[PDB]
Write a protein that binds this ligand. Sequence first.
Ligand SMILES: Nc1nonc1N1CCCCC1
Length: 119
Amino acid sequence: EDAMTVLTPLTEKDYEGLKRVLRSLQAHKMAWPFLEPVDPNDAPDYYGVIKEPMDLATMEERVQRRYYEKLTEFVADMTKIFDNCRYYNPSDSPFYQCAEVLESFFVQKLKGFKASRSH
Ligand SMILES: Nc1nonc1N1CCCCC1
């Protein structure tokens, strides 16, 4: 990550961009596994093996409350969603597949956000 990402405090204009990025991911066809916290009734062992769970509704709550002070912190929460999924699930599962697709989409949108910040 460059100078600006780590170091620049997030402004109110930055927050309008982050809201737009998050809504784009929530609208993606392969975001369904990540929209809400993992239901433990679907996997009674999940919260024993994943120590820092994350999901897009938790991220939306945090954006609304202005939790994030730097872009790096927002990126770290988003990356946790995809890394948790690839550690819990095998590489041939549809959940793993969805993480691969959605992370590539996030990277495209994040590059767009960074470009709009700089000019
Ligand atoms: N929603 C998910 N995203 O990644 N992995 C997920 N799981 C939900 C189904 C049982 C536990 C694993």
